């Protein structure tokens, strides 16, 4: 019947684009994988304190940055100062 | 010629201008318009921002093009 | 007994800048003076401008137009830059 | 201890069965990148047994020339019948054993076959991405006022085409100038290098955002991340240079620039002139555009904003002379989308201006959309109806604080439909609701259907 | 026969068959349905630590089948009816 050619088109569609997409998703996580044996999953923290790393956010100014320019290390949260003092040549 | 400027608002406003006419005067009619001075005025013209001291024909503007006014929000 | 001192902070600095870099006790004693007094003549002037403003409250804003009072131009306007920056910072976290 | 298929490690035990396959397989991915549409309905999704088009997948052989559905298990008899174990997915490619009941999507060979002949040497010089970068995934410190720059470079880091572009040495290929102190795009390589891959051979990954950095302080010291300044300018001012370096790089009546930036990011405005009595007419100009200024005021929705937008406007300072009605008249003007870009960029108008000369922003929550359409926005109609235009939201920016002082974030979307939030250092996994309950102010959009 | 109907499809194929199977994605895309079936294969991919395609779709295909909304599920079967009395003799 023509409500039931109809279902049949449906079903045709969805089954066609369920098993691209399935296949798609099983392909690309298999890869993933087999690539890296050792994976973890990025971090996710409901608190929203850790990173993808499942680290908090490092200590600035305890970071410091080596310039090439000049030669001098730089605290890195006070580099683009140093780089005004230091480009004005 | 005349051309148009849209504001934050999104209403259009027109201006008599010269091809030859710089971005300050242009700013400056924008100003006596809107009471904004330059310094506060981004003008906006295909994908660049228009710069004090060059010409609306350095930038091929013609008639009844359309210029967007902005501000700025600043981050650090 | 506490006798305070901007040692540390000072030191702090000096590894952020040169790290491989020590200073004198002599020229720690001097930079302390020199923020003792800074402080006083920032802080006096400051409550001066509230003062001098009908005002019972001294904000940041006093503080920016007393730099752009005691220092000269780029001086003035870097320090305010800086000033401002710390703010935002300390507001948005 | 996952497995691979030993049936194609047995095919490949023959290398010149290997070879065979190999041709078949980048033959087919060529055919499906260069077919058309009813062709590929009546030649690949066609049973060859029950004649009907998408019974289910229908899958290709890779032995003969038949075609078979999953519905009535006719490849799968194709499989039992002529003992053709290998099948290819005529939605994606993807090759399926019929013994293992899976597909293989884990050997590297099969992904990348078009480099079959010359493996053994890709084998040789270059090796995988390492976990740690695969993503390429990695924070960049604030070194002062530079929010208002990495927020912006996020969405850059993680766009497609320009890193189909970075990745594909165009820049390094072709620079004249081959020093990134001095090319932006070099630079931008070597950040692309730091965070994907490795440098020859704790500080790390910074190299190239200093060398950004530096040739800004060149170009102007106020953008270059001492202070404050708008993202919006720095996003046009940035692509500016970047158009500026392509035509640097070039050794050449074009009135359209040829550029990434120009076939990625630019469409056009139609702006219609129309007489009010005779609603004919009209008189059509056409403006490029880079990304679109949306105003928000008494607003709450994306849509609602466009909507504004687009809407018609009558101007009543623009001197207008009817000569279909011959009368003076307020001319009607409207803005409507002549081309759409590949990647649309949008601004919030998340200000305004006040009479005592002050500005204010608008915090205002402005709901968007996962997807958008642009149909109604469309000014040409067909032979009529303007069809469906969907982008897919990939980029956020989101500013806190005020008009004059403030903080920059970014939230990217990555495979698998993961949300990551970047904040100077910190990169960290967020859920989509969250970010769509974000104040937005910077959308990144990415075309996704054209109907 | 039941050749008519492969022929009835080989007729739909030459004509209207990129309309309906957009307008679906489209409907199925900006509903959620996707990124929920998305959702639904990462966790089961990791309950299961597997990514065996057919056992994987074993369990997705039915559940996938039953979140069509029934607004989308409806439109589309009632456009594809109007596309239908088009081309048939009853
Ligand atoms: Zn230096
Ligand atoms: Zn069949
Ligand atoms: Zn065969
Ligand atoms: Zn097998
Ligand atoms: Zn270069
Ligand atoms: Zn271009
Ligand atoms: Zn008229």
Redesign the pocket.
């Known amino acids: 019947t023509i409500d039931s050619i109809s279902n049949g088109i449906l079903n045709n569609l969805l089954t066609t684009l369920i098993q691209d997409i399935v296949a798609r998703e099983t392909t690309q996580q298999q890869l993933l994988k087999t690539r890296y044996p050792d994976l973890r999953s990025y971090y996710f923290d409901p608190n929203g304190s850790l990173d993808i790393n499942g680290l908090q956010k490092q200590q600035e100014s305890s970071q410091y940055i080596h310039c090439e320019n000049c030669g001098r290390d730089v605290s890195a949260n006070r580099l683009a100062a140093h780089l005004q003092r230091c480009l004005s040549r | 010629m005349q051309i148009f400027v849209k504001t934050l608002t999104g209403k259009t406003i027109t201006l008599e201008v010269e091809p030859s006419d710089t971005i300050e005067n242009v700013k400056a009619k924008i100003q006596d318009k809107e009471g904004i001075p330059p310094d506060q005025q981004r003008l906006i013209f295909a994908g660049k921002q228009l710069e004090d001291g060059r010409t609306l024909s350095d930038y091929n503007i013609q008639k009844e093009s359309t210029l967007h006014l902005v501000l700025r929000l600043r981050g650090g | 007994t506490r006798k305070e001192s901007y040692a540390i902070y000072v030191y702090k600095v000096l590894k952020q800048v040169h790290p491989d870099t020590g200073i004198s006790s002599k020229a720690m004693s001097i930079m302390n003076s020199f923020v003792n007094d800074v402080f006083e003549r920032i802080a006096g002037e400051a409550s001066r401008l509230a003062h001098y403003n009908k005002r019972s409250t001294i904000t940041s804003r006093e503080i920016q137009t007393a730099v752009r009072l005691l220092l000269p131009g780029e001086l003035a306007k870097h320090a305010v830059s800086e000033g401002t920056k710390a703010v935002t910072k300390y507001t948005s976290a | 201890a996952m497995s691979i298929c030993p049936h194609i490690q047995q095919v490949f035990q023959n290398e010149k069965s290997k070879d065979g396959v190999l041709k078949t397989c980048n033959a087919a991915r060529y055919i499906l990148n260069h077919s058309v549409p009813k062709e590929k309905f009546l030649n690949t999704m066609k049973c060859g047994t029950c004649h009907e088009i998408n019974s289910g997948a229908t899958f290709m ?6 075609c078979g559905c999953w519905n009535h298990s006719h490849f799968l008899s ?2 039992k019948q ?1 003992g ?1 174990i290998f ?1 290819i997915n005529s939605n994606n490619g993807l090759l399926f054993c019929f013994k293992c009941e899976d597909y293989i999507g884990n050997i590297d060979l099969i992904n990348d076959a078009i480099l079959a002949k010359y493996w053994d040497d890709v084998c040789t010089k270059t090796m995988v991405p390492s976990m740690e970068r695969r993503d390429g995934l990695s924070g960049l410190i604030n070194m002062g006022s530079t929010a208002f720059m990495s927020s912006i470079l996020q969405c850059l880091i993680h766009n497609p085409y320009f890193i189909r572009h970075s990745m594909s040495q165009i820049h390094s290929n072709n620079c004249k100038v081959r020093s990134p102190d001095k090319c932006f795009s070099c630079a931008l390589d070597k950040i692309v290098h730091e965070l994907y891959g490795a440098l020859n051979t704790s500080t790390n990954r910074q190299t190239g955002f200093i060398y950004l950095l530096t040739c800004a302080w060149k170009i102007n010291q106020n953008l270059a991340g001492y202070s404050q300044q708008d993202a919006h300018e720095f996003w046009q001012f940035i692509i500016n240079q970047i158009h500026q370096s392509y035509v640097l790089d070039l050794p050449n009546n074009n009135k359209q620039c040829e550029c990434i930036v120009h076939t990625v990011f630019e469409g056009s405005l139609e702006s219609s002139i129309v007489c009010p009595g005779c609603q004919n007419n009209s008189k059509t100009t056409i403006d490029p555009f880079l990304d679109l200024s949306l105003d928000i005021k008494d607003k709450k929705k994306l849509y609602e904003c466009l909507d504004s937008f687009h809407k018609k406007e009558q101007l009543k300072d623009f001197n207008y002379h009817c000569g279909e009605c011959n009368s003076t008249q307020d001319a009607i003007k409207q803005l409507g989308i002549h081309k759409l870009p590949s990647v649309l960029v949008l601004q919030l108008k998340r200000f305004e201006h006040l009479l005592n000369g002050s500005n204010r922003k608008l915090d205002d929550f402005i709901e968007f959309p996962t997807y958008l359409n642009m149909k109604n926005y469309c000014s040409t109609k067909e032979k009529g109806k303007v069809p469906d235009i969907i982008y897919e939201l990939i980029g956020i920016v989101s500013h806190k604080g005020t008009v004059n002082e403030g903080h920059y974030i970014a939230f990217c979307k990555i495979s698998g439909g993961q949300w990551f939030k970047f904040n100077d250092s910190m990169v960290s996994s967020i859920s989509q609701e969250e970010v769509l309950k974000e104040q937005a102010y910077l959308l990144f959009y990415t075309i996704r259907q054209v109907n | 026969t039941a050749q008519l109907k492969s022929q009835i499809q080989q007729y739909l194929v030459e004509s209207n068959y990129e309309l309906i199977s957009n307008e679906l994605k489209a409907r199925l895309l900006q509903e959620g349905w996707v990124d929920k079936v998305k959702d639904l294969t990462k966790s089961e991919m990791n309950i299961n630590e597997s990514t065996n395609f057919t056992q994987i779709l074993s369990t997705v295909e039915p559940k996938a089948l039953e979140m069509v909304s029934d607004s989308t599920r409806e439109t589309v079967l009632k456009q594809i009816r109007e596309f239908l009395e088009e081309i048939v003799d009853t």
Do not use: K
């Open positions: 052989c890779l032995q003969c020339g038949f194709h499989s002529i053709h099948g």
